[PDB]
Amino acid sequence: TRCKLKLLRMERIKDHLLLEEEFVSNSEILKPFEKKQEEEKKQLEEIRGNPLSIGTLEEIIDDDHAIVTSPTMPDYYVSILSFVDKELLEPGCSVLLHHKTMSIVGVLQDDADPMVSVMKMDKSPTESYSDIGGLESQIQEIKESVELPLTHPELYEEMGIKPPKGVILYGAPGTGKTLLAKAVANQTSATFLRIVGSELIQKYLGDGPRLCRQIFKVAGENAPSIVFIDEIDAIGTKRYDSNSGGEREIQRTMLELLNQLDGFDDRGDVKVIMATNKIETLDPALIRPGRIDRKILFENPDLSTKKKILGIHTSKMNLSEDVNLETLVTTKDDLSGADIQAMCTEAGLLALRERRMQVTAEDFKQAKERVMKNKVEENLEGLYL
Amino acid sequence: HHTDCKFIRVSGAELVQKYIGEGSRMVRELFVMAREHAPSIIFMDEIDSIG
Amino acid sequence: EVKRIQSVPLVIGQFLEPIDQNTGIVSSTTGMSYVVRILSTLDRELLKP
């Protein structure tokens, strides 16, 4: 009771003050200036018409022009002029054009696009510094590769080695490979990119290779970063369709991904994470070792590892005096970490079933037998016996 | 009907609706719709005679 | 004068749904969403689907 009040003491006053502070300041900003900056703004608005057609800058020719490719079907030789500089632009950046006669009138985007919006996230990570136990060892391998160059680059220099680039998490479902990456990201306090690899692909053609570029482009602006491209399996060796409407799309999109990962330089400052079911849903060579270090094979919790996962859950639920910690383990045979969480959800539903406010002995025992029954084989001991 | 939840019901695999966008991205929009109009039950179909 | 407007040429679209009781949103066979004023002297009970 006393400490949840202390969270309230810290959060209510500081946070409530912060809203109020923003709200007055929006007025207050205006008042210091009354000419010069106001004037320049005023003529920016006369110059720039309403609406503005979006552009994408392909390239700058150094003579006060450029070439843009726009969602308007023909391309344009546009000029660079009015409240924009030649060096305020870089190629491949998104520009704002004048409706009447296309001209770069400045930038207020700088790689602002919807695919950027999905990718950047302001969400809170689900796990923070391995909240849920088990897989102690595997995290002390992600950390060596990913977290460790960011935190201390010096140690690699004494060693005289180049620092790693990226990790590949793979193997079993229900082992929380996608959640360890979230843990590592919160530990450092890095920039995290939840983009999903499957969100670049659509029926419509020719859109995809833009999207692959934009990932590497944004990641480098906000570096240091951790990039997670989750579920790069779907864009693997496989094909969209066996008829039509996708013969090209997977082929261009994957190839284009390998290229801009290597083309950065061999960096140890923008890490990638590829989350994949297996290497049998991807191409047999990726990009392909010395360059992609390290590879982490997830396999099923062992008796030690699954104990650890379980102890977390059971303590957050009523009672444990009824059926010993050991007696849960003993009854269970080795399975993924989802099966361990599943037994506890079912146990809780069973306490509801009885209409108890205690997880009784009976509830534990049934919940254990249920999961084992899904998920079953018996010809391991049938070949034998 | 009794829970006082949304319905939809999604019949089969999604590609079929294209009237605006494509059916690949209506899966992405499954989130946006489910949440705003929560409380929802979604009866997602796919019999799997695909096999 | 209204009746002239009602006769051909017309472009097919498909009514989706209302947003008001006198304005609706359609999408055409052109492939463009247009928010349209609905004409008086038509269904608005059997127009909704």
Add this chain to the structure above:
Amino acid sequence: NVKDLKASQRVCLRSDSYMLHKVLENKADPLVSLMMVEKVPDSTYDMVGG
């Protein structure tokens, strides 16, 4: 205002300048129109007893 328009707000526009009208919370997609087709859920557990 730009304090009255939010991120991910659907809006109406003209077509001769695309000048805004007003805010709309009705978001129009084929999936949302699928709910219009389906209509209301029906029946009761004792109709489907056994």
Add this chain to the structure above:
Amino acid sequence: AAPYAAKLKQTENDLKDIEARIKEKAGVKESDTGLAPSHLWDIMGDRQRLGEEHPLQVARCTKIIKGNGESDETTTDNNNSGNSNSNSNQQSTDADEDDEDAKYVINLKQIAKFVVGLGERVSPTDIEEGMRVGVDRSKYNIELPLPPRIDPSVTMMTVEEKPDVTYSDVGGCKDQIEKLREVVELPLLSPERFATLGIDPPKGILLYGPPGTGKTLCARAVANRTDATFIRVIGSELVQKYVGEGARMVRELFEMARTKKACIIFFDEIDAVGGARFDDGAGGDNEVQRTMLELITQLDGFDPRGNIKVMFATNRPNTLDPALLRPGRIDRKVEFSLPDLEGRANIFRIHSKSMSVERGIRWELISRLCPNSTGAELRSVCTEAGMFAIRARRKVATEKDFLKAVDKVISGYKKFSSTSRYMQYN
């Protein structure tokens, strides 16, 4: 339930306050774009924006006509073509004469084709096939030529001249490397011997092999040794190909090498772009087929090549045209393959050389334990061993630190078949 219940609602209001706080924040951002040196750009800025002088559409020539002999008047003429230089100057039964030539037919990037005239800045020697040309917003006519394609500036990046790679940065003094020397250096020094024998001197080579061997390192190695300038194109890094854009990618760099003497044209990774066509496939492409048709003819044309050598690296020889695999394009074929024990000793010695480690290590000792492998895997053993070494807090990775690193890659191999052997006691 007062201890948690009351405190639950209090938790909730704070979160909602925080959501509201973020929408207040993002509606105002940082002012504006106004910069004092580009406020002076505004003086010129009003005049050009209101004038009819931009934008110019990007078009590009796709078809050349000669503007007499075209068949523009069709009165007393016949066919689709005339005399190929006259059509209205030999007859006035058309009732017209015109003296316009090299009119040219452009394509827009909307895929709409138009014939246009020529400006006051244009003459037929400023225009060509494949060259960007700017045309009006309304009624079209060429104003200013723009340089050919989107290739310039993007190609130059890929080209590095005079590599900082020799046969010290390649391990093994492999069989392929000995046949590689014969192709570049030997007919460059002395084209006399080849002439007298009555063989036509090797100048084509295709380096191919599994990934991770270092087919490229060698190719760079000899480029420096022969002391020739190096021109590189990578046809899976450079993916411009659209309607014979990649034929312009090929042409420039080949054309540049040809103006110089003592050169290497290295065409790399041509599995795509100038590679296999996908008409047969479901891809329907024959955009990479223009790149192919150009590449062949550039070679064939260059011949005798004056001791300027055309090299090829491609991963697979399955992605090549059988016209390349006729002699006079490719003459020598080298498959790169797994290095021997000492060859794998050498790739380990270079990796280890960069490291700051204890010197008491012996390179042969480590590579024994190692199986037959790719160079890229031996890069991995040193980088992995580096990570184990800092973790244990040694500033050196001992011989023992590299044996742990070797073992983990192998253990994976065991996981995919079956573990445990008879070599735990033999």
